[PDB]
Task: structure prediction
Amino acid sequence: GSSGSSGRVKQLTDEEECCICMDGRADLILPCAHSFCQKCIDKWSDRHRNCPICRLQMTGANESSGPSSG
Ligand SMILES: [Zn+2]
Ligand SMILES: [Zn+2]
Result:
């Protein structure tokens, strides 16, 4: 009713934020709706322009590319 400690108006200043950890802000953003902060980006040795999320292709769409022997 007329009680409660938490539960007040919260400014929407924030606009974007990492997707992996989602701390508060995002260092960069991808054209596929995927952002990553310095922390994470740095963590992932292979920080190639390539997108990690998409790369996974988890229940995405029919796209044949091919494995990587290396
Ligand atoms: Zn992050
Ligand atoms: Zn992506």
Summary: The CA atoms of residues 55 and 69 lie 16 Å apart. The longest helix spans residues 38-43.
